[PDB]
Prior knowledge:
It is found in: Secreted. The chain is mainly alpha-helical.
Amino acid sequence: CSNLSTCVLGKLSQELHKLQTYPRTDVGAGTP
Ligand SMILES: *[C@@H]1O[C@H](CO)[C@@H](O)[C@H](O)[C@H]1NC(C)=O
């Protein structure tokens, strides 16, 4: 980082895309 603004926004946005509340399985069973 260097901006300390676009840093923050970009980091948390990228994190939310990556993790996204861990979409492992979503149908009924919900297997790991
Ligand atoms: C600004 O923010 C982005 C996104 O988080 C980051 O990748 C980058 O290293 C930061 N600094 C610059 C100079 O772009």
